[PDB]
Design a protein around this nucleic acid. Structure first.
Ligand SMILES: [Mg+2]
Ligand SMILES: [Mg+2]
Ligand SMILES: [Mg+2]
Ligand SMILES: [Mg+2]
Ligand SMILES: [Mg+2]
Ligand SMILES: [Mg+2]
Ligand SMILES: [Mg+2]
Ligand SMILES: [Mg+2]
Ligand SMILES: [Mg+2]
Ligand SMILES: [Mg+2]
Ligand SMILES: [Mg+2]
Ligand SMILES: [Mg+2]
Ligand SMILES: [Mg+2]
Ligand SMILES: [Mg+2]
Ligand SMILES: [Mg+2]
Ligand SMILES: [Mg+2]
Ligand SMILES: [Mg+2]
Ligand SMILES: [Mg+2]
Ligand SMILES: [Mg+2]
Ligand SMILES: [Mg+2]
Ligand SMILES: [Mg+2]
Ligand SMILES: [Mg+2]
Ligand SMILES: [Mg+2]
Ligand SMILES: [Mg+2]
Ligand SMILES: [Mg+2]
Ligand SMILES: [Mg+2]
Ligand SMILES: [Mg+2]
Ligand SMILES: [Mg+2]
Ligand SMILES: [Mg+2]
Ligand SMILES: [Mg+2]
Ligand SMILES: [Mg+2]
Ligand SMILES: [Mg+2]
Ligand SMILES: [Mg+2]
Ligand SMILES: [Mg+2]
Ligand SMILES: [Mg+2]
Ligand SMILES: [Mg+2]
Ligand SMILES: [Mg+2]
Ligand SMILES: [Mg+2]
Ligand SMILES: [Mg+2]
Ligand SMILES: [Mg+2]
Ligand SMILES: [Mg+2]
Ligand SMILES: [Mg+2]
Ligand SMILES: [Mg+2]
Ligand SMILES: [Mg+2]
Ligand SMILES: [Mg+2]
Ligand SMILES: [Mg+2]
Ligand SMILES: [Mg+2]
Ligand SMILES: [Mg+2]
Ligand SMILES: [Mg+2]
Ligand SMILES: [Mg+2]
Ligand SMILES: [Mg+2]
Ligand SMILES: [Mg+2]
Ligand SMILES: [Mg+2]
Ligand SMILES: [Mg+2]
Ligand SMILES: [Mg+2]
Ligand SMILES: [Mg+2]
Ligand SMILES: [Mg+2]
Ligand SMILES: [Mg+2]
Ligand SMILES: [Mg+2]
Ligand SMILES: [Mg+2]
Ligand SMILES: [Mg+2]
Ligand SMILES: [Mg+2]
Ligand SMILES: [Mg+2]
Ligand SMILES: [Mg+2]
Ligand SMILES: [Mg+2]
Ligand SMILES: [Mg+2]
Ligand SMILES: [Mg+2]
Ligand SMILES: [Mg+2]
Ligand SMILES: [Mg+2]
Ligand SMILES: [Mg+2]
Ligand SMILES: [Mg+2]
Ligand SMILES: [Mg+2]
Ligand SMILES: [Mg+2]
Ligand SMILES: [Mg+2]
Ligand SMILES: [Mg+2]
Ligand SMILES: [Mg+2]
Ligand SMILES: [Mg+2]
Ligand SMILES: [Mg+2]
Ligand SMILES: [Mg+2]
Ligand SMILES: [Mg+2]
Ligand SMILES: [Mg+2]
Ligand SMILES: [Mg+2]
Ligand SMILES: [Mg+2]
Ligand SMILES: [Mg+2]
Ligand SMILES: [Mg+2]
Ligand SMILES: [Mg+2]
Ligand SMILES: [Mg+2]
Ligand SMILES: [Mg+2]
Ligand SMILES: [Mg+2]
Ligand SMILES: [Mg+2]
Ligand SMILES: [Mg+2]
Ligand SMILES: [Mg+2]
Ligand SMILES: [Mg+2]
Ligand SMILES: [Mg+2]
Ligand SMILES: [Mg+2]
Ligand SMILES: [Mg+2]
Ligand SMILES: [Mg+2]
Ligand SMILES: [Mg+2]
Ligand SMILES: [Mg+2]
Ligand SMILES: [Mg+2]
Ligand SMILES: [Mg+2]
Ligand SMILES: [Mg+2]
Ligand SMILES: [Mg+2]
Ligand SMILES: [Mg+2]
Lengths: 48, 122, 131
RNA sequence: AUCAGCUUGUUGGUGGGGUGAUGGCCUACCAAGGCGACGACGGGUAGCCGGCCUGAGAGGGUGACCGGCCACACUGGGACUGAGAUACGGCCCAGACUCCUACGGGAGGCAGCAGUGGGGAAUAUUGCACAAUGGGCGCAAGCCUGAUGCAGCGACGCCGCGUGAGGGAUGACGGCCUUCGGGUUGUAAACCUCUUUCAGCACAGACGAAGCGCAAGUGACGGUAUGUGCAGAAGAAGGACCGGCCAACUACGUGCCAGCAGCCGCGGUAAUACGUAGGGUCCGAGCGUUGUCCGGAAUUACUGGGCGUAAAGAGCUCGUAGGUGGUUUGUCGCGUUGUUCGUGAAAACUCACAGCUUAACUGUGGGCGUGCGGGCGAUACGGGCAGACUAGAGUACUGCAGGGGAGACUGGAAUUCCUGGUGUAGCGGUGGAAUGCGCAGAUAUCAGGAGGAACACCGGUGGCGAAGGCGGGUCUCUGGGCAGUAACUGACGCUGAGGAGCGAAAGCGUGGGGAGCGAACAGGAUUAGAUACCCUGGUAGUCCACGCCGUAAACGGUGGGUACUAGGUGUGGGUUUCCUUCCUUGGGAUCCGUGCCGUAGCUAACGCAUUAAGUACCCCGCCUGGGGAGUACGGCCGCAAGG
RNA sequence: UCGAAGGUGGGAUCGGCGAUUGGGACGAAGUCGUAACAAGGUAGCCGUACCGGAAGGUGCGGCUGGAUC
């Protein structure tokens, strides 16, 4: 019953490579595009 | 143990020391006895018990204690063996059921008759 | 280090009760203040009032004793702590001392007592059991 | 992790093909990485779920039947057909097995319903029908359906019923004990009356079918279920236990034999524990044994355990990833509760209703269906984000005590040795003596010199260091800690899995040193015996420099940090103030360190007791009966001993 | 082109057996011994090195879970 913090890594698709290291973004699900990726990028809200 | 320790590791439950592993969890096996002889008990008890060496279908060699006061078992005999522990004999974990296959119930039994396999008097 | 003001407050209060003391001075905080407020409202404590110290505000709590000197507080324990944080739904509100104690639950309104919280149907995390 | 790296269409982009649909699904060209200590890749096991058992709950075990999916059809592959293929009784090929042959060649896949052989402890009948319902065909009639309804076998399980009675004696045989008075089986029994359930023998005899047919009928079950009559208590009880745990005792027969047994444990001539009799207990068409699973087991402790001695604090620090934060000054609401509509298949569980005469069985409608989806309404705590202050922490100013560490220089006493006097027959030794050195001049004693180790007093239950540990002086450089002013930083704090650094003595390599001491080894001594304790000698080592191993009862047998909780008596360091000589452990206030005794409290006890084992918070390591065993294998480090 | 089966050759895992050897536990009773528990007749124990049929002895360092004074 104790709260546990866990994280998973999921790889998405971007068309311009506009995302740098240490930024937070929104994601949406899509059709499969290759192995082990099933997502696209929504938009970049902040840049660090 | 603290919360992060429990989260990181988890607690492993105890493992059960299985008894009569030659049965593989199966209550009864049929076996053929190879030799029949006698053994001596430990210090507290002094007697001369009867035990048999039986080849199991599981290809496991194990001792088998013979209950009752009389028996007709000889070498190369069909035996039905159940599981049962004896204290005095060190390495005996099995008891031979009476009244099945080649062994017949010991005579003159009238009390506790079903255990030793005696038919009803008329 | 100093890592849990609420547990420290509860332990200092019950240690003072065990030692038969009368006044305790602690660093002031909103959580300590309103917990003392609900303690005053239920009547397990005598009275509280804030003060000013060399640096910042401090709160003093006066324990309650009767003519026959028996303790007005039986025991305290905290259930929700950093790490193991326990929470209650709207239907599983904890029962303390067979309903004769008090559980402090922070609801949308605030730190409020379990009986009226169940009356409202609201719920949340239980701070401590006081009985 | 006694599995630390994995991968090369692998990862990503572009262009083509591909498929019902997007896609490294396939190809070509570009770049090098993705997944990885919030356990990848490896190894073993296993169909998943609604459910079942246990447990108050948490939880643990599990996947019988039914039902929702998954995968397969002797083993391995491949493809056609079709709206729809792992295509079980479809196809093709390669294997193994079996069968037929006229020898030229062919046919097979019960894990479908039954059945046989083998394994086992063992699990049924080579049964009747489309009457009802689902499924396929056809306009329908109608046809097929081991799906299905039914029957047969088996105390294997949840459930109901039968083997009788009413009265009958201070209690008839016979058995067992006896104290020889008698007591036991016993209202039991023989007896007088009763209804005779269910089987037995007969009659009637269903519903299951507002169903299908434009026909005249249609029920396998079954001539059963169910009613109506006949005769007779007539046909019907056994299994475990009776030493304590655990409701139930006496006698008879052998005595460390024959034997019992779940724990303790019971027989060595007079057993309530062995065997037989009675007697009683429990259960009952079932009775026990055996095996698996839960509970008690708080015996893996989140609720709900400990680490002084029983099992455990790693040797101790620095510190990465993670986990956790000292006040109040500001939005979005991502930890979260704030209400509502919106899913929760069926079945099962729980509540009430209703039907089969009640019984299993099922007949109807609720309710249950403890999780998850979106739209609408909240902001007290529990996080990021958008700004300021400081009670933790650090710095800054002045002082403080200290065997803290390293290098170099230097001092005295003592031992041994050498040299030279003097000086004579013994010196050293133990409970006693002898191996030992002397008459070649010992011991003793004086003078001088040489070399190596260590610093007696101060020196203490005192100081410092994180811990091992640390003390002859002097210099050189340097760490840590403490008090006051509080100038400044303004959430920087804590602990820390894996990782890395330090570390008692002994041990190893290289090269030096080596006075004393002293494993090993010789002798002398004791003892029946000494390969020990004792004596005489003395080789490694003990010292130095560079590396190594990294273990100690490495102890406070107690990890660190923070806040709170009565005192008394000493010590050390520093600030202040006042009797004031202003000398004085004078008196008082304050913080840090270190001894002793003691409250409340805790602990099984001894004991701890503000320097907690007290009451809590944060994180980390360790323990789940004793041997086996801190051992084998495997992995890592070390040249090895070894860890 | 792919493609199952088959054959070449060397690495891992699970194993089964294997002369003989090393170690452990249970028997019961015997010889050799005096180790430890009382200052157990040499205080005990721990780490480590050497030695000896054997329990053990010694060296160095550490603790008192050591008794007297
Ligand atoms: Mg603790
Ligand atoms: Mg019996
Ligand atoms: Mg008996
Ligand atoms: Mg493409
Ligand atoms: Mg496209
Ligand atoms: Mg693709
Ligand atoms: Mg391409
Ligand atoms: Mg479930
Ligand atoms: Mg429970
Ligand atoms: Mg449980
Ligand atoms: Mg399951
Ligand atoms: Mg089904
Ligand atoms: Mg589906
Ligand atoms: Mg196949
Ligand atoms: Mg296949
Ligand atoms: Mg197929
Ligand atoms: Mg078929
Ligand atoms: Mg077939
Ligand atoms: Mg087949
Ligand atoms: Mg079949
Ligand atoms: Mg068979
Ligand atoms: Mg059966
Ligand atoms: Mg039909
Ligand atoms: Mg018609
Ligand atoms: Mg036909
Ligand atoms: Mg037909
Ligand atoms: Mg049937
Ligand atoms: Mg049967
Ligand atoms: Mg039968
Ligand atoms: Mg019945
Ligand atoms: Mg009668
Ligand atoms: Mg009848
Ligand atoms: Mg009809
Ligand atoms: Mg009709
Ligand atoms: Mg009837
Ligand atoms: Mg009894
Ligand atoms: Mg009883
Ligand atoms: Mg007798
Ligand atoms: Mg009886
Ligand atoms: Mg159980
Ligand atoms: Mg807790
Ligand atoms: Mg526990
Ligand atoms: Mg211990
Ligand atoms: Mg330890
Ligand atoms: Mg250790
Ligand atoms: Mg960080
Ligand atoms: Mg919301
Ligand atoms: Mg809603
Ligand atoms: Mg809902
Ligand atoms: Mg329903
Ligand atoms: Mg229930
Ligand atoms: Mg009814
Ligand atoms: Mg229902
Ligand atoms: Mg449940
Ligand atoms: Mg945070
Ligand atoms: Mg300011
Ligand atoms: Mg400061
Ligand atoms: Mg100083
Ligand atoms: Mg140096
Ligand atoms: Mg001389
Ligand atoms: Mg001289
Ligand atoms: Mg020298
Ligand atoms: Mg300022
Ligand atoms: Mg710190
Ligand atoms: Mg840390
Ligand atoms: Mg850290
Ligand atoms: Mg770690
Ligand atoms: Mg670690
Ligand atoms: Mg290093
Ligand atoms: Mg190093
Ligand atoms: Mg040394
Ligand atoms: Mg050394
Ligand atoms: Mg050596
Ligand atoms: Mg060396
Ligand atoms: Mg050398
Ligand atoms: Mg010497
Ligand atoms: Mg010596
Ligand atoms: Mg010699
Ligand atoms: Mg000698
Ligand atoms: Mg150790
Ligand atoms: Mg030490
Ligand atoms: Mg420690
Ligand atoms: Mg602490
Ligand atoms: Mg103090
Ligand atoms: Mg008290
Ligand atoms: Mg007590
Ligand atoms: Mg005390
Ligand atoms: Mg303390
Ligand atoms: Mg404790
Ligand atoms: Mg174990
Ligand atoms: Mg041993
Ligand atoms: Mg061990
Ligand atoms: Mg190995
Ligand atoms: Mg092997
Ligand atoms: Mg072998
Ligand atoms: Mg002897
Ligand atoms: Mg001795
Ligand atoms: Mg001796
Ligand atoms: Mg001794
Ligand atoms: Mg000793
Ligand atoms: Mg040793
Ligand atoms: Mg020696
Ligand atoms: Mg020592
Ligand atoms: Mg002691």
């Amino acid at each position: 019953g104790k709260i546990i913090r866990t994280t998973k890594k999921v790889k998405a698709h971007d068309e311009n490579g506009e995302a740098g290291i240490g930024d937070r973004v929104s994601l949406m699900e899509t059709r499969p595009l290759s192995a082990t990726k099933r997502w696209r990028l929504v938009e970049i809200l902040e840049k660090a | 143990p603290t919360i992060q320790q429990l989260v990181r590791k988890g607690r492993r439950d105890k493992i059960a020391k299985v008894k009569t592993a030659a049965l593989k969890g199966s209550p009864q096996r049929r076996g053929v006895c190879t030799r029949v002889y006698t053994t001596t008990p430990k210090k507290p008890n002094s007697a001369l018990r009867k035990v048999a060496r039986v080849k199991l279908t599981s290809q496991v060699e194990v001792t088998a204690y013979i209950p009752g006061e009389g028996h007709n078992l000889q070498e190369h005999s069909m035996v039905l063996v159940r599981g049962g522990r004896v204290k005095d004999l060190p390495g005996v974990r099995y008891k031979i059921i009476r009244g099945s296959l080649d062994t017949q119930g010991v005579k003159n039994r009238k009390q506790a008759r079903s255990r030793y396999g005696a038919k009803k008097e008329k | 280090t100093m890592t849990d003001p609420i547990a420290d407050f509860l332990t200092r209060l019950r240690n003072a009760n065990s030692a038969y003391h009368d006044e305790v001075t602690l660093p002031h905080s909103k959580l300590k203040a309103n917990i003392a407020e609900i303690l005053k409202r239920e009547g397990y404590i005598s009275d509280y009032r804030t003060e000013d110290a060399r640096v910042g505000k401090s709160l003093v709590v006066q324990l309650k004793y009767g003519p026959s000197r028996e303790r007005s507080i039986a025991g305290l324990r905290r259930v929700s702590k950093p790490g193991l944080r326990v929470y209650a739904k709207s239907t599983n509100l904890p029962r303390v001392l067979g309903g004769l104690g008090v559980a402090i639950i922070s609801t949308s309104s605030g730190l409020l007592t379990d009986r009226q919280a169940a009356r409202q149907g609201v719920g949340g995390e239980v701070l401590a059991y006081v009985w």
